[PDB]
Amino acid sequence: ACLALADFHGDGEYKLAMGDLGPDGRQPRLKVLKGHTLVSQKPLPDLPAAAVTFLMASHEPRTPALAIASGPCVYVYKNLKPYFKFSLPSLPTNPLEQDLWNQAKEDQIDPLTLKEMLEGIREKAEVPLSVQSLRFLPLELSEMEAFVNQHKSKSIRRQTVITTMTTLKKNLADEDAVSCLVLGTENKELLVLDPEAFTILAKMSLPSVPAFLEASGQFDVEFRLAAACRNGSIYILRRDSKRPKYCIELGAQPVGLVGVHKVLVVGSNQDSLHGFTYKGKRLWTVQMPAAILAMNLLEQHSRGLQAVMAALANEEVRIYHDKVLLNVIRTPEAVTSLCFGRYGREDNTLIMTTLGGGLIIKILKLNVPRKTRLYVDQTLREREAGTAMHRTFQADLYLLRLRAARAYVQALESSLSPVSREPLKLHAVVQGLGPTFKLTLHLQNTSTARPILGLVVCFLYNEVLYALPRAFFKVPLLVPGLNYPLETFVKSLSDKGISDIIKVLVLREGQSTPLLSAHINMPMSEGL
Amino acid sequence: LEKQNWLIHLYYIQKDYEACKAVIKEQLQETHGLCEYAIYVQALIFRLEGNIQESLRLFQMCAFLSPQCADNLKQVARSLFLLGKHKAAIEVYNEAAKLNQKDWEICHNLGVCYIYLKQFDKAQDQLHNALHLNRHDLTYIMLGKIFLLKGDLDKAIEIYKKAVEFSPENTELLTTLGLLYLQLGIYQKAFEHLGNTLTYDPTNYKAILAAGSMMQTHGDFDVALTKYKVVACAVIESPPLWNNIGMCFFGKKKYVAAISCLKRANYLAPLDWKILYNLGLVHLTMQQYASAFHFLSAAINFQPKMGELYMLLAVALTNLEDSENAKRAYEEAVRLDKCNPLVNLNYAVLLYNQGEKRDALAQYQEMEKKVSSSLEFDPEMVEVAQKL
Secondary structure, eight states, rough: OBBBOOOOOOOOSSSOOOOBBOOSSSSSSSOOOOTTTTOOOSSSOOOOOOOOOOOOOOOOOOSSSOOOOOSSSSOOOSSSOOOOOSSSOOSOOOOHHHTTTGOSSSSSOOOOHHHTTTTTTTTTSSSBTTTTTSSSSSSOOOOTTTTTHOOOBBBOOOOOEEOOOOSSSSSSSSSSOOEEEEEESSSSOOEEEEETTTTTEEEEEEEEEOOTTTTTTTTTOOOOOOOOOOSSSOOOOOTSOOOOOOEEOSSSOOOEEEESSSSSSEEESSEEEEEOOOOOOEEEEEESSSOOOOOOOOSSSSSOOOOEOOOOOOOOOEOOSSSSSEEEEEOOOOBBOOOBBBOOOOOBBOOOESSSSEEEEEOOOOOOOOOOOOHHHHHHHHHSSSHHHHHHHHHHHHHHHOOOOHHHHHHHHHHHOSOOOOOEEEEEEESSSSSSSEEEEEEEEESSOBBBSSSSEEOOOOOTHHHHHHEEOOEEEEEEEOEEEEEEEEEESSSSOOOOOEEEEEEEEEEEEESSEEEEEEOOOOOO | OOOOTTGGGHHEEEEEEEEHHHHHHHHHHHSSSSSSSSSHHHHHHHHHHHOOHHHHHHHHHHHHHHHHHHHHHHHHHEEEEEETTTTTHHHHHHHTTTOOOOOOHHHHHHHHHHHHHTOOHHHHHHHHHHHHHHOOOOHHHHHHHHHHHOOOTTHHHHHHHHHSSSTTTTTTHHHHHHHHHHHHOOOOOHHHHHHHHHOOOOOOOHHHHHHHHHHTSSOOOOHHHHHHHHHTSSSOOOOHHHHHHHHHHHHOOOOOHHHHHHHHHHHHHOHHHHHHHHHHHHHTTTTTHHHHHHHHHHHHHHHSSOOOOHHHHHHHHHTTOOOOHHHHHHHHHHHOOOSSSHHHHHHHHHHHHHHOOOOHHHHHHHHHOOOOOOTTTHHHHHHHHHTO
């Protein structure tokens, strides 16, 4: 049972919220933790998707909330009344289950009771096997998947999967005079919906890369909304989609973002964190030894002066006062959110929501070169004897062309080129010390699209020094573009270390002149 | 289905790629497949990593699950196009289009595919369509590329101007239009657009290079030298930058400090004919005549259909006690040169110095038919005239 939400919806008495995930995203209840006694004060059922973060105000009656449910759509809590405009309410008790969940109501899910549910799919036809609903969690994994194709009853559409939103705060404690609803989805589409006209005002897709936590703590007081790109940049893309300021100044991707309405405390992956202001200036960075998973900062007494709860990526927590170090100990394997746990009107109680299942509360001008006398003497010699240099260099070039053509013709004669219409390329690699070496011939057809059918490899060695099992073998059909490793086991027989060359000839089966060849100097034996 | 929902979306956003990947092997097992998001994370996430094979496989599975979805076919054709197969990408984009006839992405991708397939009529028409559905910058860039590859800049200037007309903050569009202005006679609007680019990005290497080139062309080598100092450390080893810097230092009579930069650029690119031509020219000006021939012959072997190369090879040659080779090189040049009278004047000088005075008049008349700014080619024009 992994969880997503953690939020302190205070001022009731100490009412803390926790959104757990059930079988298929269900909140059986969005449980209230009651962190110093671990009981349920007010249960919050009827939510089909994992919510992450609530929302409060000063004029609210403290029981309703705002559950941004990662799943189908959003369900704003209004005392067990999710009422959004046209596509966001989507039957908060699972609509894609209970059209077909009625056959799995005799007991819990186990493969014993599933094989008696043969009539239960067809003794009650609430839908004609609609593709949106017939296969959600609990059914037979094999036998009813052949009836999906022949039925194919059509579906509907809705808003895409969300993570975070942005809403209004001024006319909030009536839940109907709201104007702007800018929510962040997974496809980085912060759709701006308005209930005054049932319209879509804008959509924020300028990152077009998914945010982790979209709004730095659900809003900023200066409305400099902080979207976090999954590339290594954090944006200052303002509220109601104004013009972007973008600070790319991060060494890697940002992990976790909260704010205390003065600073932007982001994570990193280059083993640090960065505290940016609303404009983009780095106020203060903090060095940590490992990567960060999730941070936060507590309430402000002065302008943001309390402790930071910063977990790590090797189960460690690390607490700080920005300049002075407090803790390194190993509680959470992973974590979702770190918020208040304050009860009895004390200063500060800290909560910690791990991913094993527990709810932990534990307190502890240029570089232009320079030329010496040698250069001016050499240039003077060149200026006084340029003709002889030109003539002798041309003579040397003629002789070099002659000798290169000579050696090229001699190689063509002996066919010693491992690269040579008739396209091929072969080179032999030797591996291993000891009396037994692994000799792998990497052979390759280098042509646009033409295979080579009849080829064969023949080895030439000294039969008194090396014992090759198969010194001659056919090669597979060489497909243009693939390196075929064809390996053999050479074995040194000389009791004394003797290194002798081994030739390899690749040749057709109807011809006697090798198509190409290769050489390998076998290393020393290191025998026994 | 997908009970976790964001669990296997938490390690991925932070790019953990361990818990998020290992969790898949567990989440999938519990749900016995049919989640549709675990597979999706493997796909687009796989494509974000270097791998574009498992991405193609999982997009194939997503298309199999929803046979009548255009986005899945688009993604499969895109995974094809990320590999080398463009014909199959076209044939999958077609099916993706016969399910949705109102999106610009299919038409833009068909354009960029037909571009790689050298089918320019279909690519051009498809990209015109992609504009008419929804105008995007990349479609404009691909259309300009089509009109440059196929034909002339006369067709690309209109497209790039219309492109920069709206959304004028894209550095690529501004810089490419400025480059295409350089490619033609206009040097003023080229400077305008390159400065427009440099306002946004001051350290733009691709724009600083062309701005410094234009500056060098109209004298004032120190301004171009400062422009190059702006970007010298960003690209410390780039043959074009050092070639332009060597030409800067050759402008203001720093011949040794120009040979240095030009030889450094030649070492980092031994197959670049411009640096070889520049080395030959500077070694001609330095009166070395042994190296000049070598570098000019190299630049000839790299771009043989030029007229000035053979002129300079003949020019040096004349000083290397080989006049017959200079004769045949000048013949090659005059045959291969059309709009540069310097070759004709230099061949007339060679002829008149050979004691002929007969064909020197022929080369003088060829030059005067060809024709005008050089201070020292003016005097030799009139001195070989009056003395003939």
